Amino acid sequence: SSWWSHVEMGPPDPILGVTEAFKRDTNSKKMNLGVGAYRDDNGKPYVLNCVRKAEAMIAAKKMDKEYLPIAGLADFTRASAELALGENSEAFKSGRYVTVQGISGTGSLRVGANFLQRFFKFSRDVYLPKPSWGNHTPIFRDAGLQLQAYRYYDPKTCSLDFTGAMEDISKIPEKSIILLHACAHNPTGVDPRQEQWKELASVVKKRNLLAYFDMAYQGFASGDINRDAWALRHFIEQGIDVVLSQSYAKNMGLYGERAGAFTVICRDAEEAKRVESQLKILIRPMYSNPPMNGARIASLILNTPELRKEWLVEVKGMADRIISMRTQLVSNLKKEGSSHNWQHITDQIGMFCFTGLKPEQVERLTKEFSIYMTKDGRISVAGVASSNVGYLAHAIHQVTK
Amino acid sequence: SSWWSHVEMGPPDPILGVTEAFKRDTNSKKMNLGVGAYRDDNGKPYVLNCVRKAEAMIAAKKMDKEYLPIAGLADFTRASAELALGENSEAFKSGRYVTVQGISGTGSLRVGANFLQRFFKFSRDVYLPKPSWGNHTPIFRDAGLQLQAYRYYDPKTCSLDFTGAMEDISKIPEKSIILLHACAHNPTGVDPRQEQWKELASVVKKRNLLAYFDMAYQGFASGDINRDAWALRHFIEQGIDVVLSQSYAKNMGLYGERAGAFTVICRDAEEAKRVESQLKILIRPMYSNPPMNGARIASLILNTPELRKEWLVEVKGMADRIISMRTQLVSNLKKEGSSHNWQHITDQIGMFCFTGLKPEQVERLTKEFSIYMTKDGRISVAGVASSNVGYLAHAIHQVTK
Ligand SMILES: Cc1ncc(COP(=O)(O)O)c(CN[C@@](C)(CC(=O)O)C(=O)O)c1O
Numbered sequence: 118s119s120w121w122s123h124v125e126m127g128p129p130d131p132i133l134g135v136t137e138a139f140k141r142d143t144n145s146k147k148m149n150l151g152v153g154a155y156r157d158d159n160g161k162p163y164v165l166n167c168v169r170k171a172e173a174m175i176a177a178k179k180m181d182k183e184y185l186p187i188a189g190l191a192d193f194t195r196a197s198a199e200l201a202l203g204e205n206s207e208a209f210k211s212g213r214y215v216t217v218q219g220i221s222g223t224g225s226l227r228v229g230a231n232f233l234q235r236f237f238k239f240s241r242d243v244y245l246p247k248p249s250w251g252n253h254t255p256i257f258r259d260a261g262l263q264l265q266a267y268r269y270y271d272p273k274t275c276s277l278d279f280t281g282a283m284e285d286i287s288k289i290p291e292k293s294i295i296l297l298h299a300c301a302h303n304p305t306g307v308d309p310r311q312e313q314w315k316e317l318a319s320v321v322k323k324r325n326l327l328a329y330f331d332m333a334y335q336g337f338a339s340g341d342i343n344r345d346a347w348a349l350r351h352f353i354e355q356g357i358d359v360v361l362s363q364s365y366a367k368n369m370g371l372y373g374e375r376a377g378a379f380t381v382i383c384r385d386a387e388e389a390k391r392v393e394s395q396l397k398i399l400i401r402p403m404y405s406n407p408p409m410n411g412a413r414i415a416s417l418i419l420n421t422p423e424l425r426k427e428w429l430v431e432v433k434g435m436a437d438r439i440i441s442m443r444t445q446l447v448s449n450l451k452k453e454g455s456s457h458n459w460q461h462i463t464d465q466i467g468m469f470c471f472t473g474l475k476p477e478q479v480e481r482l483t484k485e486f487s488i489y490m491t492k493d494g495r496i497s498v499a500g501v502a503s504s505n506v507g508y509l510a511h512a513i514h515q516v517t518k
Numbered sequence: 519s520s521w522w523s524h525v526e527m528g529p530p531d532p533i534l535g536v537t538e539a540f541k542r543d544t545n546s547k548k549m550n551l552g553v554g555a556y557r558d559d560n561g562k563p564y565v566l567n568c569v570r571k572a573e574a575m576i577a578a579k580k581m582d583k584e585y586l587p588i589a590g591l592a593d594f595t596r597a598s599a600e601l602a603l604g605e606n607s608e609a610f611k612s613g614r615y616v617t618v619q620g621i622s623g624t625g626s627l628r629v630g631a632n633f634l635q636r637f638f639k640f641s642r643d644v645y646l647p648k649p650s651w652g653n654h655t656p657i658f659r660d661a662g663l664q665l666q667a668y669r670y671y672d673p674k675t676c677s678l679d680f681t682g683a684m685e686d687i688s689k690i691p692e693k694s695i696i697l698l699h700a701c702a703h704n705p706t707g708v709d710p711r712q713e714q715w716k717e718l719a720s721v722v723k724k725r726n727l728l729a730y731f732d733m734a735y736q737g738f739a740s741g742d743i744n745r746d747a748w749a750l751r752h753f754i755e756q757g758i759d760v761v762l763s764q765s766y767a768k769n770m771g772l773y774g775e776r777a778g779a780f781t782v783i784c785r786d787a788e789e790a791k792r793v794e795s796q797l798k799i800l801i802r803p804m805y806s807n808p809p810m811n812g813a814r815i816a817s818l819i820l821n822t823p824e825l826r827k828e829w830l831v832e833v834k835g836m837a838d839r840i841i842s843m844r845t846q847l848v849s850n851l852k853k854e855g856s857s858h859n860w861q862h863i864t865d866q867i868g869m870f871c872f873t874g875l876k877p878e879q880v881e882r883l884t885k886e887f888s889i890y891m892t893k894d895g896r897i898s899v900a901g902v903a904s905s906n907v908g909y910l911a912h913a914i915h916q917v918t919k
């Protein structure tokens with residue numbers, strides 16, 4: 118008997134653990150369709166051109182490695198709020214906001230919750246869609262907040278259950294926290310329509326709840342970053358002071374570098390200064406200050422007219438590609454002879470596809486086809502190549518035949 | 519009344535906030551000697567040569583930016599452990615340890631604090647030395663632990679109060695936690711001498727305390743890495759299963775990059791595997807995975823023979839230079855006519871000087887000389903330049919006259 122004898126072995130991550138299990142498979146035809154990591158048409162990681170360019174300038178400017186402020190890189194931060202909010206935003210213009218650099222999306226979401234457990238006097242509950250990204254549960258629970266749920270998807274229909282959502286939401290106690298996916302919901306691949314959003318904003322505004330936005334995919338729903346912040350902006354413009362988390366891990370391909378942020382919309386700029394000091398007090402004892410490499414890069418790209426230009430054209434490129442993957446998939450499905458309707462493949466948006474497959478099926482994929490996915494039927498359509506789509510379609514078809 | 523009306527204004531950080539205040543001083547003669555960051559002789563940041571080289575390799579290698587495992591870059595993680603434990607180390611040759619990449623020493627420290635709060639079922643108390651680095655308090659507290667203290671420095675003599683330490687130490691309830699700075703005790707600069715250290719070990723082992731070592735300055739206390747970890751290694755050799763955080767921020771100047779780790783010393787490798795399992799689960803909903811640049815760099819260096827050579831050498835030169843500043847600083851104070859005994863400056867080791875100055879002096883230093891330092895009297899001797907030690911001498915003296 119020592120110190121950690123009583124420590125159990127916990128199981129691998131639902132999402133991240135799949136990469137592990139993949140990594141160990143010997144088959145030449147493996148497919149990593151678990152984590153949402155974008156592949157090129159060659160089946161290779163893709164590091165944006167504007168990111169490669171961005172580095173080079175960093176390299177060439179012979180930059181120091183001194184410590185950032187608790188809050189991050191002022192140019193990154195500001196540009197982040199601006200990307201989310203928009204330049205003509207009142208929010209932004211009056212600077213009634215506070216942006217804090219963070220360890221990518223997760224790091225932001227966490228910091229946010231931490232902030233919430235401290236300061237959000239009103240409630241301890243956080244409502245999340247049914248379903249939602251695996252990770253949101255732990256993040257919030259570990260932060261010391263309660264979790265709840267609101268209806269969201271209809272597996273029967275392979276679409277949004279707006280009637281249900283509305284019921285639920287409408288019954289959420291006043292001043293509670295409600296998590297909303299800004300765009301390209303994970304893992305569904307379905308977002309409310311502009312009209313439905315307007316509705317939610319009504320209810321949310323009426324019942325006076327807290328709207329926490331998780332935006333890990335700006336530009337990946339529509340391929341437009343603007344279009345993509347529509348709902349988040351509307352809410353703001355409707356008068357609802359939201360809090361939000363942003364990740365550049367995917368839209369800018371800075372997965373490993375960890376560039377993200379956490380934002381709080383306040384009444385006044387004073388309020389902001391205040392909320393800021395608290396968040397610094399909160400981060401410091403968590404990791405002191407944030408990683409500088411990705412922030413620099415992003416900072417550089419958002420703030421340089423020519424890289425921001427190049428950036429958008431590259432973002433559209435990846436969505437387009439994901440698009441061409443859904444398509445071709447569905448096609449290879451029919452050509453394999455699939456009896457079933459795979460419409461939801463092309464109708465869903467984002468990186469994934471929530472196909473409806475059952476567990477043995479997933480099992481089957483892995484085991485016979487060395488096709489990696491989450492046990493929920495969710496594949497990562499972005500990790501598919503022109504070179505492997507027929508195989509997957511094959512495999513999906515057989516295990517489903 | 520809004521959501522955040524009750525959010526008060528929080529104070530600036532006792533260490534990091536200084537850097538803020540300096541930033542806003544226009545005096546052409548300002549000196550920031552608050553946080554422990556190394557400057558060259560010209561009073562400028564120093565990017566290790568070895569680091570510029572590793573950089574350029576990562577570059578020419580054309581690497582991806584894909585997510586790193588939840589526990590980090592294996593190669594960095596391995597090297598860290600080896601650096602700390604030594605290559606002949608049983609604990610290391612047998613694999614009874616678990617290192618995980620963290621967000622610098624601070625993150626590392628927090629993860630271990632979180633793990634402890636979770637799995638250390640025998641005690642909630644954390645014993646810190648008097649005095650200790652300011653951030654230790656909050657990290658421990660924010661994690662759900664209780665803080666306690668033990669005697670350490672005796673300001674009347676400007677040295678370790680080994681007597682009281684042993685006393686205190688000897689009375690600590692069994693199975694409690696004991697924080698020990700591996701070397702270059704921040705902010706004191708007074709470390710136990712080997713023999714004393716032998717005597718601490720015995721009391722630690724006898725009362726059965728869990729020893730958590732803070733290892734942020736390897737190679738800054740003696741210029742020697744191995745000699746610097748003597749204590750740590752001794753502890754473990756006597757069979758004391760420690761927990762430990764490590765930073766490469768200083769020692770490799772990767773401040774901003776956020777590069778460190780947290781190691782748990784297990785009974786066996788199985789135990790070790792279990793513990794890790796739990797670590798990941800603890801880290802996943804915090805930040806998901808850690809930031810890759812710092813680790814690529816430290817890894818490339820720690821593992822590429824020539825780079826190691828180079829690195830070590832650069833560590834000597836930095837330690838050497840600090841020493842000369844101390845020496846020069848003391849002399850200048852005499853050349854200016856100081857009556858007081860400044861021996862301590864030279865006696866102390868590491869990055870700072872715990873000069874004894876009282877609050878009002880610190881004030882004057884700020885106000886009239888625009889000389890920045892923590893209010894405890896702590897100046898960072900690593901931040902003095904050939905070109906300003908004079909000035910400093912001058913100022914310290916006038917305020918002291
Ligand atoms: C809804 C959602 N929020 C936040 C994040 C934060 O990720 P970050 O910390 O790396 O920026 C992701 C990433 N989701 C991925 C693609 C990866 C992951 O699980 O972390 C996923 O596979 O679902 C996400 O899908």
Ligand SMILES: Cc1ncc(COP(=O)(O)O)c(CN[C@@](C)(CC(=O)O)C(=O)O)c1O
Nearest residue numbers: 405533553554622623624651704734765767
């Ligand atoms: C004892 C000790 N531990 C851990 C750290 C953490 O540094 P890291 O989180 O970047 O890896 C520091 C840093 N001490 C500094 C240099 C910086 C600080 O206050 O955070 C100091 O000024 O004392 C330290 O002095």
